[PDB]
Design a protein around this nucleic acid. Structure first.
Ligand SMILES: [Zn+2]
Ligand SMILES: [Zn+2]
Ligand SMILES: [Zn+2]
Lengths: 65, 147, 645, 648
RNA sequence: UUUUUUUUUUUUUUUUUUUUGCGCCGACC
DNA sequence: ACTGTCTGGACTGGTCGGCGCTATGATC
DNA sequence: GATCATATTGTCCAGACAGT
């Protein structure tokens, strides 16, 4: 199963969080966002919404529940 | 860059987006970002400088049908990136339809709305007696808006 | 909520492996509803005798169900052959079913006593030589559609049933023996009124609903037809899904009418604890109610799939069997004597903290059908009693002269060549009338056939399927002797309208027992229409006739009744037949019977709650009990909560 | 909060239509909205609104609602010009102290020593000044003695004006979510205080609205949380709190066993809504909660709630006066009547539906005349169910009469002042202490004693609150304050200490004095220090006015034991020798005895259909219920906790 | 030394009588 | 006003019998 | 090993129409 972090909204397959090292990950999330370039327009839009998102390219989630 | 639409099989947008992302990573495709909202079914958004990059990225995948010949303005998909509760935007007194949950395919009237717990209380319209029930905000769909 | 079922299961497994010898080979231990299931690889060492199983059940205080491991399973054909060879030929085995998922074989036999054994040793022998846990049910002498349908539904949904049972067992044993801080009793319906009964038992840990029913008299008004769904406690229980179980006292629409409505809107997901006769009769009655509501043109309350879901969520309990339905509540059922499968609900909350007995509809005098209600309990503190006949002047006539008058009226009618039409309920008084008629005809008094039309045949078949729930006389006749009173050749069933027309047109005398006491539907109206002009015939009323019904119009003495004809014109029915009324066959307890039950109950309850009756009748009964015995009595209204402890 | 159907828009439209039809065009209606139970009307030209005083009364009678008329915020006088006009226009004898302006709603708060001059005959002065200033006035009484609690509450309300206005608007929208609705059924569940003393909790439940009455805490069994707090495990209470369906909370009087649990709900965000209480009750319950958390911190135990929770309780409290009928629910109307137990003590009267049923919850009350407060109101327009306290419901529970108790207290003070002995009277700050000071002042008025009386602790705050609210006192005290012009509270013999130095040098002065201190149980405060420094002083007297509980220093003092070892601070123990005589006068209690309860039952009007006896021991409650049933024939009940009784 | 809320009775049972379509190929008159 | 071009349509009735054809990829 | 959504979008005659 794939779970998303509650802090940086990063989806990872292991317990450790490779972005902020948070131990609270949520198994329920929607609207998967894939970031390949940091300077992307949608990455910039997500940055002003969630400050911790789009710091490192990879999978991301819009909301955590 | 520019937002482009890729028509994919309904209910399997996340896997197609993941395969496209992996192919772009492995083969160094000039793909900027990929957005796949859960509410949108059968369509994904890929940011690329030109549609030729999208066409080259999505080819070779059975589940990527075609790229829509057009460019989406960023204001159209701006609201998708913003995080808003599903309960918000609902007012008591209207009629909603429960897409999922134990009450699938049932019409209900909204009674109480609270954004703290992200839950909405509704009353079934076909019930002979009013029995309020608590359901998730994302499970309901607004049929009509009255009061 | 937090649960400790895993720790309890681990402790139980440790106790088992401490007590059971190692050669048995215990593999899995789990909970299936209110009983414990143990899987072993060597059933021979586990159950060489019943003493080990009895000791395990006594120590664990659970119902032990030993099943073989699924890996060691004989082929179904070899298993069937071995079961047929082991069972004596006197027990006629009809159907044998197998469950590949869990070790269990269902055996349908005409004589389940021989299959079970004198002390259960035959079941152990079968499950040892064949490695299949046996379950024995009775094949009725008269085929029943409802019971066959229920068995087919249970067999075809084995996986869902097993999942539901496992979930129920996990929910029941979420924690060990817990002492409740307080016990609360609230009545959502049936308090100071007749019909739409609903009793909620609330503790600090578990919630129990008792005889959730519906009202038919006030069906036009939704505020009185259904129990109070607006109660804050009931709303909190239903919204959070904290309802542990639902128990139905007996199969009647005022006690089980609202049960499928909860499953229609997914308001309930737990188990239902009724006796098998109660389950079958309540399913038949609910189906008939749905069909009647559909035929009347009104919107049906629920659907047959909801009744199927009720069947799939029903756990069957016998008389005197103690089962754990909650972490702090223990439930046992005792005979009530009202109808077939009628049970008095006894609740043992805590480890001796409190005891509640909900009698419901019951009878305390011996009858031709069932034994009198059980008045002895291991412990009793609060008693909930019906007050249908709680008035001071309410005194039903004794049974013997009422049945003598019925017999002499029938004999007089048959002497002149007339026909006897007896409108009656689907269950209850009809079977008592058939038993009385069979007793009268067994000595050669009458030779005319007795015709049962409508649901009378189905109810008779259901009654034959469960002879152990009947009275001691019928039980002795069926078991000790080879004579079945229900299997008399005088009882005939009419299949279609052609047979009914032949019966009506025949000049030979006959007795017809229809299925509509008020002549408001069914074959009763047709029989009355086609037999009214004949002066030799007679009609006997054995139940109260409500105002506005055809039966009340005939009973009052109306010689002519204008009705709508087939062509749309008014038709006149000339009632030249004799009219008789014998209301001595009512299954409800008399006021004298209620007083005798209060006086002779052991132990004496601390308080008595009077429900299920008119407000003045309930108040009169409570005042009479308080003045005669000194016990504190209350007659609360609806939405009233009483803190017993 | 939680969103509801909120049909208040149609009701407001109909009310505006009625106002337009009745009130003239020149009034200039601009905005009509609900601020709690009251109705707020904004007018461009308030001159034509109130040319005659009968128009507002007629509009209020027609609309059946309290109406507050304020000018539109578009036109407003400057605050300096408005203040100058108000100061120069009111009579100089009003003695206005502080003037505060609220430009958001166009309301001015006026604080004066004599609000009667500001209001005038049927509000003619108020109408004239708000016509000449174009500002909605609100008048409160400035106490002769400065009160820290009242000043802090007023400052908090003024500084938090916008959130208070938003909360009031939300409350008004929630109250009028439906029109005049007739309830189908009424039931009352006792979550606490039933067949027990303390931690009272009464929940009135209808098919539309839920009302909580007197949410309190128990201090005798605080060690066990099950017996200290109201029953939160009740399914009805859980359903009400989880769904946010609690319409309002009403407090009968300020006590820890009636209002001690209020900050707990706001600490964990369990309840969000209005609290209806008398302003003296609000001030005294805030003081009591502050004392409770202070003594909890001093004892080393974790406090139940923080002072910010008390501030939240203050910000969510709506104040009502005696005899004012207000709508708190679509089907429930609330009225408060005098109880006579303590200052601000009220009898909760609930009018459910349009004459469908009426419930009166007396709580703690007194029926005999009292020097401090008038006797409880026994006359109601409609009454069907009566809920009353049963603290002294036993047949032998007859208390010692006040007149000869006062005579005994006077002779004790005489025999202890002729010899020049010091006096120590341990009493609670809210209870019998004020009655003791009133008795002493009346005795010293003739000239029997001239030694000043020192009040140490929270007694000064309670005295200041009593001065700030004299209209809730007895008829004689109101007469003396208003027309006689003499203030019994302002006697020169009443002195207040400043710090521990004043206590120390008044201890070592040696002159005879009368000392009143809080913490009558002698568990803390200045009382223990005063007793420690008074124990070796020969020839002194101490009077006890309340019952003493086991395990306390007061019980040991009352027992008359010669050796009283008391553990001191910093982990060291101290031993003192007592030669100080003890006096026991339990005649100043504010709880009605058995005879008063029977007299109240007999003299109530109209006779209720049923009487429910609560707030007392189980045997006493049962005895009182049986006695009332045998004497008057009324169907009485003594329900236990978690018992719901259907009334209609 | 003080203003603006209201109040009361008429609707009954525990339930009922039968393979459509699609296309291809061959063939007769 | 002529003239070549694009588009739509109907393709004789009946009868005999036979011979196939009417899901699939991806979790849980 | 069992189920679940989804599953792609032949020539000739006559009438209407751009082109010169
Ligand atoms: Zn993270
Ligand atoms: Zn019944
Ligand atoms: Zn009190």
């Amino acid at each position: 199963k794939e779970r998303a972090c509650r802090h940086c909204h990063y989806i990872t397959t292991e317990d450790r969080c490779p972005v902020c090292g948070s131990r609270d990950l949520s198994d329920d999330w929607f609207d998967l966002v894939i970031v390949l370039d940091v300077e992307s327009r949608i990455a910039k839009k997500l940055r002003e919404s969630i400050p911790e998102a789009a710091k490192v390219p990879g999978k991301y989630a819009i909301r955590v529940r | 860059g520019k937002i482009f639409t890729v028509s994919v099989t309904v209910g399997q947008e996340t896997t197609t987006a993941n395969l496209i992302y992996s192919k772009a990573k492995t083969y160094n495709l000039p793909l900027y970002a990929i957005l796949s909202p859960s509410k949108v079914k059968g369509y994904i958004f890929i940011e690329a400088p030109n549609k030729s990059a999208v066409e080259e990225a999505i080819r070779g995948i059975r589940h990527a049908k075609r790229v829509l010949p057009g460019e989406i303005p960023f204001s159209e998909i701006e609201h998708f990136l913003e995080e808003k509760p599903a309960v918000s935007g609902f007012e008591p007194g209207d009629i909603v339809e429960l897409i999922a949950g134990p009450f699938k395919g049932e019409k209900a009237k909204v009674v109480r709305v609270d954004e703290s717990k992200d839950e909405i209380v509704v009353e079934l319209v076909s019930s002979v007696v009013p029995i309020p029930v608590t359901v998730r905000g994302e499970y309901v769909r607004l049929i009509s808006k009255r009061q | 909520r937090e649960t400790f079922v895993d720790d309890i299961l681990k402790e139980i497994r440790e106790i088992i492996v401490q007590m059971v010898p190692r050669e048995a080979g215990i593999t899995d231990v789990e909970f299936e509803g209110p009983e414990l299931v143990i899987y072993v690889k060597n059933p021979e060492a586990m159950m060489k005798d019943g003493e080990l199983i009895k000791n395990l059940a006594k120590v664990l205080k659970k119902r032990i169900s030993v099943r073989p491991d699924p890996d060691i399973l004989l082929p179904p054909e070899k298993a069937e052959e071995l079961i047929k060879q082991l069972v004596p030929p006197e027990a006629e085995i009809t159907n044998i079913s197998f469950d590949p998922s869990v070790g269990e074989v269902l055996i349908e036999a005409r004589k389940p006593g021989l299959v079970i054994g004198k002390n259960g040793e035959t079941l152990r022998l079968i499950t040892q030589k064949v490695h299949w846990a046996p379950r024995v049910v009775r094949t009725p002498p008269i085929q029943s559609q409802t019971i066959y349908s229920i068995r087919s539904i249970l067999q075809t949904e084995s996986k869902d049933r097993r999942k539901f049972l496992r979930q129920v067992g996990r929910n029941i044993y979420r924690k060990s023996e817990y002492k409740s801080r307080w016990i609360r009793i609230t009545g959502l319906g049936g308090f100071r009124e007749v019909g739409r009964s609903a009793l909620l038992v609330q503790t600090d840990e578990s919630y129990v609903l008792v005889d959730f029913g519906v009202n038919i008299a006030a069906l036009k008004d939704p505020t009185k037809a259904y129990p109070h769904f607006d109660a804050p406690e009931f709303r909190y229980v239903l919204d959070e899904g904290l309802l542990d179980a639902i128990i139905i006292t007996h199969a009647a629409l005022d006690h089980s009418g609202m049960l499928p409505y909860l499953f229609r809107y997914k308001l309930f997901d737990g188990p239902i604890y009724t006796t098998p006769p109660t389950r079958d009769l309540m399913t038949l009655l609910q189906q008939d109610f749905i069909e009647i509501q559909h035929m009347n043109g009104v919107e049906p309350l629920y659907r047959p799939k909801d009744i199927k879901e009720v069947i799939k969520h029903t756990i069957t309990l016998d008389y005197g069997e103690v089962r754990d339905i909650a972490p702090d509540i223990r439930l046992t059922l005792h005979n009530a004597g009202h109808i077939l499968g009628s049970s008095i609900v006894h609740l043992h909350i805590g480890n001796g903290l409190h005891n509640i007995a909900i009698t419901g509809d019951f009878k305390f005098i011996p009858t031709r059908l069932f034994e009198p209600a059980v008045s002895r309990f291991p412990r009793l503190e609060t008693l909930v009693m019906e007050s249908t006949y709680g008035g001071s002047n309410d005194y039903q006539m004794p049974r013997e002269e009422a049945e003598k008058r019925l017999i002499e009226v029938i004999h007089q009618t048959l002497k002149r060549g007339g026909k006897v039409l007896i409108p009656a309920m689907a269950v209850g008084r009809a079977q008592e009338i058939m038993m009385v008629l069979e007793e009268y005809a067994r000595v050669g008094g009458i030779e005319v056939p007795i015709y049962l039309d409508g649901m009378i045949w189905e109810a008779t078949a259901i009654h034959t399927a469960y002879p152990e729930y009947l009275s001691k006389h019928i039980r002795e006749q069926i078991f000790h002797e080879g004579y079945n009173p229900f299997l008399n050749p005088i009882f005939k069933s009419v299949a279609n309208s052609r047979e009914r027309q032949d019966i009506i047109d025949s000049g030979e005398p006959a007795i017809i027992i229809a299925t509509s006491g008020m002549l408001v539907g069914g074959p009763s109206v047709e029989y009355f229409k086609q037999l009214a002009p004949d002066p030799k015939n007679s009609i006997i009323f054995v139940s109260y006739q409500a105002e506005g019904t055809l039966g009340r119009q005939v009973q009052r003495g109306l010689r002519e009744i204008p009705i709508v004809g087939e062509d749309g014109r008014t038709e006149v029915i000339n009632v030249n037949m004799e009219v008789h009324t014998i209301d001595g066959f009512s299954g409800a307890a008399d006021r004298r019977e209620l007083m005798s039950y209060v006086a002779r109950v052991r132990p004496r309850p601390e308080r008595i709650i009077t429900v299920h009756g008119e407000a003045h009748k309930c108040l009169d009964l409570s005042s009479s009990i308080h003045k005669k015995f000194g016990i504190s009595t209350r007659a609360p209204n609806n939405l009233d909560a009483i803190r017993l402890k």
